[PDB]
Amino acid sequence: SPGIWQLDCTHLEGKVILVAVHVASGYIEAEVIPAETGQETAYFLLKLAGRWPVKTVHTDNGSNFTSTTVKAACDWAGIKQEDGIPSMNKELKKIIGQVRDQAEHLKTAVQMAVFIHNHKRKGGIGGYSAGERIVDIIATD
Amino acid sequence: SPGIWQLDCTHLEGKVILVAVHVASGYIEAEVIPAETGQETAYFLLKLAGRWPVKTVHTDNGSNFTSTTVKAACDWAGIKQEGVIESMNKELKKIIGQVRDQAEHLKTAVQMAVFIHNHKRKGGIGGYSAGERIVDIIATDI
Ligand SMILES: Oc1ccc2c(c1)OCO2
Numbered sequence A: 001s002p003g004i005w006q007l008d009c010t011h012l013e014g015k016v017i018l019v020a021v022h023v024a025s026g027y028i029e030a031e032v033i034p035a036e037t038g039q040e041t042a043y044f045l046l047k048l049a050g051r052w053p054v055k056t057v058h059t060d061n062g063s064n065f066t067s068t069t070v071k072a073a074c075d076w077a078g079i080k081q082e083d084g085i086p087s088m089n090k091e092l093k094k095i096i097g098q099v100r101d102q103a104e105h106l107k108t109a110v111q112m113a114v115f116i117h118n119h120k121r122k123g124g125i126g127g128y129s130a131g132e133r134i135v136d137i138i139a140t141d
Numbered sequence B: 001s002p003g004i005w006q007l008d009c010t011h012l013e014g015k016v017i018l019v020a021v022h023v024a025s026g027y028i029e030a031e032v033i034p035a036e037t038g039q040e041t042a043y044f045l046l047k048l049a050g051r052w053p054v055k056t057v058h059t060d061n062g063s064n065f066t067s068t069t070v071k072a073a074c075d076w077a078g079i080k081q082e083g084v085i086e087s088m089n090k091e092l093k094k095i096i097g098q099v100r101d102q103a104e105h106l107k108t109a110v111q112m113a114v115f116i117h118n119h120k121r122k123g124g125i126g127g128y129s130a131g132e133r134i135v136d137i138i139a140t141d142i
């Protein structure tokens, strides 16, 4: 459970946003990429796995994930790739709209949205953020 | 403090690597960029602060860090701008060379080195990696 990430793509203004969600916490990592190629996807995963302990990724089984370049990346990083195994994308586009008018470029609006999402307290003032939840869940002490 | 980072640049292959080290842990975030511009620096900072609770960043004297875009990003993100972390930097550049050949582009080699550094257990049985240390520091703070 703590090592499981869900990857999805979202398309906005003709650009591609790759989103990784840590399933247990709702914490997100996201980047605008040129296009869903095997090299860009592998690069994204390698970055993700270098920053958090990624054991398993669930993907939508897009052609970018069937590429050997992605399989090679997952192998090197020790990630179990789970293709086709079953709503951030709505939440995030919402937040992206709240900040869109503060950023010249979409890529910046995306990172602002990531920031807001991960810092937001869920479940009343007594609750916690996705950021707080992921470190609590992943901490080994 | 859990909120303190040190940022620095390294110039390699006519490229710039931006490196941020979480001071208390040795954990690193790094990106390869075409050039050390105000725009790229501000973007790097926004990404960092959205992923980890960044309170203060220590930087070099660069004109990039005082640009208006960086100031706007730091204001929005709540970031304040201002001898072993120099080591994590020489460590990283060493790992880069030890893997640089395994990869086509510099940036792949850089992210491989970040992976190796952050996952690497320090000390014997009983040791921790930098990645485990940052998570433990922040979880304890919360
Ligand atoms: O461990 C974290 C604590 C707070 C955060 C976070 C991670 O992402 C943004 O906010």
Ligand SMILES: Oc1ccc2c(c1)OCO2
Pocket: A119, B003, B049, B052, B053, B054, B055
């Ligand atoms: O983005 C942040 C989230 C939590 C924090 C912080 C910054 O400073 C201390 O606590």
Ligand SMILES: Oc1ccc2c(c1)OCO2
Pocket: A049, A050, A051, A052, A053, A138, B115, B118, B119, B129, B130, B131, B132, B135
């Ligand atoms: O337990 C870990 C926490 C963060 C990490 C990691 C392991 O490897 C890279 O980043």
